[PDB]
Structure 1
Amino acid sequence: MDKMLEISEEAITRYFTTLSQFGYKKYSDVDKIIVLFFMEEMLAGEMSYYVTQDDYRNIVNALYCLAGSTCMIDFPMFESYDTLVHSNNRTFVPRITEDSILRSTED
């Protein structure tokens, strides 16, 4: 992936920063961290050859339950240029005021 590594490293650095500032962090969130880096080592090891694309879908959709669950884990950002409603930059260029048998025309 190269990104599960980043998410896990960020998560545990936040974990130990919290344990440095305070002396406690919820074990319900340590559980999320344990699941997270267990998955990271699972997918970056000798057991990644058992994964189909259906398994990949399920693994990703199960990992995003951990996304905003705690402050250690964040929603990843990917490099995206899309949106639900796109912009239309097409231009209208008719030919000498012409039209077809039913409708207009352009170049």
Structure 2
Amino acid sequence: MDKMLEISEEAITRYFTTLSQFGYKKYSDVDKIIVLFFMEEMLAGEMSYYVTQDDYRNIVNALYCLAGSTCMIDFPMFESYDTLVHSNNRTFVPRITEDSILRSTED
């Protein structure tokens, strides 16, 4: 993946940063950290050969429950150039004020 690595490193670094500033992190969130790094080593090991695409779907949709659960885990950002409503940059160029038998025409 190469990204579960980054998320896990960030999460555990934040965990130990909190244990440096404070002396306590909720164990309900240590559970999430445990699940996260266990999954990453699961997927970056010899057990990555037993996964179908349905299993991949389920694993991703279950890991996204951990996304904004705590400050240690964040929503990952990917390189995206899309949106729900796109822009229309097409241009209009008819031919000498012509039309078809029913409608307009262009170049």
Deviations 1:52-89 (A, max 9, x none): 00000000000000000000000000000000000000
Shift of 1:33: 0.1
SS state of the match for residue 94, structure 1?
coil
SS state of the match for residue 105, structure 1?
coil
Shift of 1:92: 0.1
SS state of the match for residue 88, structure 2?
coil
Q: How many residues align?
A: 107
Q: How far apart, CA to CA, are the structure 1 residues paired with 2:104 and 2:64?
A: 49
Q: How far apart, CA to CA, are the structure 2 residues paired with 1:60 and 1:69?
A: 15
TM-score by structure 1 length? 1.00
Regions of 4+ moved over 3 Å:
none
SS state of the match for residue 97, structure 1?
coil
Q: Where does structure 2 lack aligned partners over 5 or more consecutive residues?
A: none
SS state of the match for residue 80, structure 2?
coil
Deviations 1:7-46 (A, max 9, x none): 0000000000000000000000000000000000000000
Q: How far apart, CA to CA, are the structure 2 residues paired with 1:51 and 1:8?
A: 21
Query: What fraction of aligned residue pairs are identical, expressed as a percent?
Result: 100
TM-score by structure 2 length? 1.00
Q: How far apart, CA to CA, are the structure 2 residues paired with 1:40 and 1:15?
A: 17
SS state of the match for residue 20, structure 2?
helix
